[PDB]
Design a binder for these strands. Structure first.
Ligand SMILES: [K+]
Ligand SMILES: [K+]
Ligand SMILES: [K+]
Ligand SMILES: [K+]
Ligand SMILES: [K+]
Ligand SMILES: [K+]
Ligand SMILES: [K+]
Ligand SMILES: [K+]
Ligand SMILES: [K+]
Ligand SMILES: [K+]
Ligand SMILES: [K+]
Ligand SMILES: [K+]
Ligand SMILES: [Mg+2]
Ligand SMILES: [Mg+2]
Ligand SMILES: [Mg+2]
Ligand SMILES: [Mg+2]
Ligand SMILES: [Mg+2]
Ligand SMILES: [Mg+2]
Ligand SMILES: [Mg+2]
Ligand SMILES: [Mg+2]
Ligand SMILES: [Mg+2]
Ligand SMILES: [Mg+2]
Ligand SMILES: [Mg+2]
Ligand SMILES: [Mg+2]
Ligand SMILES: [Mg+2]
Ligand SMILES: [Mg+2]
Ligand SMILES: [Mg+2]
Ligand SMILES: [Mg+2]
Ligand SMILES: [Mg+2]
Ligand SMILES: [Mg+2]
Ligand SMILES: [Mg+2]
Ligand SMILES: [Mg+2]
Ligand SMILES: [Mg+2]
Ligand SMILES: [Mg+2]
Ligand SMILES: [Mg+2]
Ligand SMILES: [Mg+2]
Ligand SMILES: [Mg+2]
Lengths: 86, 79, 79, 205
RNA sequence: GUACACACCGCCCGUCACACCAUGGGAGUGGGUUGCAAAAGAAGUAGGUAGCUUAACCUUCGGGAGGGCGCUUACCACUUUG
RNA sequence: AAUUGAAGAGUUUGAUCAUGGCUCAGAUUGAACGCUGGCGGCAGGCCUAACACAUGCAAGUCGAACGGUAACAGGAAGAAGCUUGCUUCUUUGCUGACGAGUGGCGGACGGGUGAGUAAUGUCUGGGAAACUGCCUGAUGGAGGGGGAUAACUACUGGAAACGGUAGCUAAUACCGCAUAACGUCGCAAGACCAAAGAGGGCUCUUGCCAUCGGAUGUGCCCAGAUGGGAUUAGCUAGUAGGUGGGGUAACGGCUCACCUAGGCGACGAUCCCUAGCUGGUCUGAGAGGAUGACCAGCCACACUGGAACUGAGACACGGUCCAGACUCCUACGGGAGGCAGCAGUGGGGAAUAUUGCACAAUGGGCGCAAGCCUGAUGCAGCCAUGCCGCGUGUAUGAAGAAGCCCUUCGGGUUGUAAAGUACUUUCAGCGGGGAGGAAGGGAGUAAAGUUAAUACCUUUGCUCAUUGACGUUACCCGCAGAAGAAGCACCGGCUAACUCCGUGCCAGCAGCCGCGGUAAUACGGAGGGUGCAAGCGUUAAUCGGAAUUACUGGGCGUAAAGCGCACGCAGGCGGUUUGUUAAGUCAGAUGUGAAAUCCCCGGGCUCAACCUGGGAACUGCAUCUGAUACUGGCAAGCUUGA
């Protein structure tokens, strides 16, 4: 980078990348647990996983890691599938 | 944001300004939303140097449009 | 009202989808003769009611597929 | 940007006096007006329709001392202006400050009037105008500068103007050396010798 | 009647020969572009997890959760072959 | 008021009329070249190599987020040569500030280019399933904690670029927890989600979080329109549709699994070639034709190919990663770079400018502000590249002078032309005056508002200094003197303008027809003339003339042209009456049709070019409301066509 602000921006974007990826990975891990429980066919396990996931997706949306619509989609999709599992 | 500012037209050494409402990002003489008046800095005596549509300007200020320093001074001198 | 088009069904082979031919009478730009022009639209038919040769009314809607942004309103005439 | 050559040759080619001299003496005494200029001038060749049209346009240009580009622009303006194009064209040429100064009698010739205008001796509505092509509106007042009032040429020109027929559309006061352009001259006011239709046709060629 | 008009001692056709010019074919030859069938797999992103490692949370204080790195798979640019 | 609009000619023949091609007169240009060249105003200026690029500059800013203190500029304190009261020398972020660093915001704008793209583009008109920093309206919140880390310090690896290890530290950096509803998920019950402080003197200002609005920007969908080629006719398996899952801000084959076999195409699919699109521009009486430089809108691209990350926004010109070709540095291990920003260089080319000045104005980023940054922009330089204006004198002047050219030697012509005489001084030159572009901002000053407060802050008047790159400004005035200022093409016909001499089918000219072989208005020179004029010619290029692709507006017995004949699908077209419909059509209204441009009426630069106010126009598209003759649809007929 030729310009000073660009050099600083590259450092900050890399720091942001690492921070975001960690949170993004964690959120996906919790979402995967819900889907695994649905695949297992245990509604109670699915609901427990869902309850752990819900605060994470909501908070990450608030942090701006994801959009609120995406958080809403995850909750809506999972709720429907868990209800079908019943 | 939306702003009211002077687009510089006219000829060299004889500036004539159109008062326009524009997205601030756009070039000075580029895309604008609406023309609300004009300012002629070198207007002759017996000729109207400044004309402004205050109702349209007020409407835009109500919608959150900012005003450039020069346009604000022009509004003051008009009223 | 709601903007609608009326056309003849030309294909009903697709499941829940029909191809409708809309005829427009247009004056030729140079020659000035009024010429029939055809526009074919893929239309959604939920109940697979329509059949080839039927006259139907269709309305524009959100995209339902790659080629479908129109839905059946009514079957005006059966084949 | 001005013709600086011999004046009488132009009149000889046209075959009519273009008033390119003061008129203190007859043109016939000064030159052989009848004969065209040059070695073969005595011979009178037959003139084509194009030739007739060209000669009429050149005559009008030579009278007012306008070059082709400016004259073409006058034609275009006259055609754009409402009414008779040919009449409009003559009106534009008459409206020139140069012509008005000569017609008011401040200048002996249009060329003399030109020098007066160019040399900032002329005021229009109390402002100095040094542009020969400047168009004088009705009710405009054209006056010599106070400094230039003392010039001998201007006094001589006024005397010559008395000998000439007085323009109806111009009101001029001698001694005061001011004049008013009352109205744009009518076609009737101008000479019937000029055939403006030939010029209009020529520019449609 | 005529395709003649310094007017039938008119006009005018084609092969052949010579020169020159554009162009078709031509064993093929060399480039450009491109189809198809495959090969390939940098970086990145996503999925998975031999191993390694870990500030913030939890903890019975051992650890756990989660994360990172590494590895692996998918996609794909270069490139390669017919 | 927005109009006013339309020319032909030459050339086939012994001659004619017709047909028909070719050629010319016009207008225009980002032009180039040749000859020539005074000034000014305004505008324009790599059309080729999207070739390669030396050097400088084109993006920062904020100390009112933070730890700080590398500077410097003080202060204080303490020591000092001891100005004996300053000076010197230290210490102290102590302060004005402020390097480097963290953090915020900007860097997605502004600027360039037209390579790609024949549609994931553009234009016009509709539309639904969206998001949207800064700005703005409303209603609330803003509690209480934690773990880090850069800078820094020590050490350490590299030639360099760039690092590594350990220790320490802050925040409006980061993460829990509490709070949780006009928010999200849910049929509901329920469940779940945030925040940040800082500054001025308890108060004020500003910032932070949530939700809902507005505004702006952006994504997406549909219809019509938008080059050429059929000696390209078939094309397509995520293909076309469905179901479900995933994905997106959002609808969607967007993706995937499964199911069905579709979908597109002679109303030209597919393939090939070419091309950024538009407002407009040039031409034209118009209808058309041609074009898309400058200016403005949209799109695309940023060494080439590819990829994501950060972010409200990018798959990012002066960011990141990878690969490649190039250039470069190297200690040979490894590094670095991207002017289609501005200026400039080399190269290519018929051809296209200065490595300028200033942020004074307008506008943009950051900032409470002051201000800082801004090759945007304003200006200046260069160039007759164009447009426009102006000058290069002007009256008098027969001697009709010389000299030239022609001549029947009488003369004629150059030519009032020149001299001579009398005047004028624009512009150029020299000198002296002198606007406007400046708004604001900064100090004070008063009042009001605010508040515990005549504080601070804000607002509004008031007062005082002050801000112009252009710039030796525009403009004005004075001075001296005709002084300092004319060329280019053409003269056989078309086509305005004629002779002499030289040359003798040569040398040469030439747009066409043609000219030149000894009396050439056609070559070359001269005299004279014609047309233009600071230009004039030539070449290239577009439209015109060309009614010569003919919609307006042509033809086909013999000039080019009726298929050898016929049947017939698609298509085009169709007798007469009534009713109905209202699609075409017609009328009105509404929305839209960016601004600029063009046109009309005005205004401003001494005029003009140029600039500018308002209108008209934008012939279109959509919708709504009407009319119903004609055409179409539908229904019922009728008899004349069949
Ligand atoms: K910064
Ligand atoms: K050959
Ligand atoms: K002809
Ligand atoms: K392009
Ligand atoms: K697809
Ligand atoms: K689907
Ligand atoms: K066009
Ligand atoms: K590219
Ligand atoms: K941002
Ligand atoms: K500035
Ligand atoms: K026709
Ligand atoms: K009818
Ligand atoms: Mg001129
Ligand atoms: Mg060959
Ligand atoms: Mg790989
Ligand atoms: Mg600093
Ligand atoms: Mg924060
Ligand atoms: Mg909470
Ligand atoms: Mg191209
Ligand atoms: Mg025509
Ligand atoms: Mg993001
Ligand atoms: Mg950038
Ligand atoms: Mg660059
Ligand atoms: Mg450059
Ligand atoms: Mg060269
Ligand atoms: Mg700088
Ligand atoms: Mg002639
Ligand atoms: Mg001879
Ligand atoms: Mg031409
Ligand atoms: Mg034509
Ligand atoms: Mg014909
Ligand atoms: Mg024959
Ligand atoms: Mg024939
Ligand atoms: Mg026949
Ligand atoms: Mg209708
Ligand atoms: Mg417009
Ligand atoms: Mg009927």
């Amino acid at each position: 980078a030729n310009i000073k602000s660009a050099k600083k921006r590259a450092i900050q974007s890399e720091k942001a990348r690492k921070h975001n990826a960690s949170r993004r990975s964690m959120m996906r891990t919790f979402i995967k647990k819900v889907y695994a429980a649905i695949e297992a066919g245990d509604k109670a396990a699915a609901q427990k996983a869902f309850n752990e996931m819900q605060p994470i997706v909501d908070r990450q949306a608030a942090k701006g890691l994801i959009h609120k619509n995406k958080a809403a989609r995850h909750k809506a999709n999972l709720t429907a599938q868990i209800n079908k599992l019943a | 944001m939306v702003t009211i500012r002077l687009a510089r037209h006219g000829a060299k050494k004889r500036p004539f300004y159109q008062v326009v409402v524009a997205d601030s990002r756009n070039a000075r003489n580029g895309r604008f939303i609406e023309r609300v008046g004009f300012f002629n800095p070198i207007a002759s005596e017996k000729e109207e140097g400044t004309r402004l549509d205050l109702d349209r300007i007020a409407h835009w200020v109500g919608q959150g449009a900012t005003i450039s320093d020069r346009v604000a001074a022009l509004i003051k001198e008009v009223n | 009202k709601i903007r609608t088009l009326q056309g003849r069904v030309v294909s009903d082979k697709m499941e829940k989808s029909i191809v409708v031919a809309i005829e427009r009478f247009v004056k030729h730009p140079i020659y000035g003769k009024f010429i029939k022009r055809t526009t074919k639209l893929h239309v959604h038919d939920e109940n697979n009611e329509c059949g080839i040769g039927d006259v139907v009314e269709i309305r524009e809607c959100r995209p339902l597929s790659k080629t479908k942004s129109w839905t059946l309103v009514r079957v005006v005439e059966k084949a | 940007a001005r013709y600086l050559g011999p004046k009488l040759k132009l009149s000889r080619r046209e075959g009519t006096d273009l008033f390119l001299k003061s008129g203190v003496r007859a043109i016939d005494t000064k030159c052989k007006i009848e004969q065209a200029p040059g070695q073969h001038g005595a011979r009178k060749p037959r003139l084509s329709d194009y030739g007739v049209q060209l000669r009429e346009k050149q005559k009008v240009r030579r009278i007012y001392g306008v070059l082709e580009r400016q004259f073409r622009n006058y034609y275009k303006e006259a055609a754009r202006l409402k009414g008779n194009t040919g009449e409009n064209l003559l009106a534009l040429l008459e409206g020139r400050l140069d012509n008005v100064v000569y017609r008011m009698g401040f200048g002996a010739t249009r060329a003399e009037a030109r020098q007066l205008v160019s040399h900032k001796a002329i005021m229009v509505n109390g402002r100095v105008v040094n542009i020969a092509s400047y168009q004088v509106s009705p009710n405009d007042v054209v006056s010599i500068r106070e400094k230039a009032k003392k010039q001998s040429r201007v006094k001589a020109a006024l005397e010559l103007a008395e000998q000439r027929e007085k323009p109806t559309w111009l009101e001029v006061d001698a001694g005061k050396m001011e004049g008013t352009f009352k109205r744009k001259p009518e076609r009737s006011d101008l000479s019937a010798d000029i055939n403006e239709h030939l010029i209009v046709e020529l520019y449609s060629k």
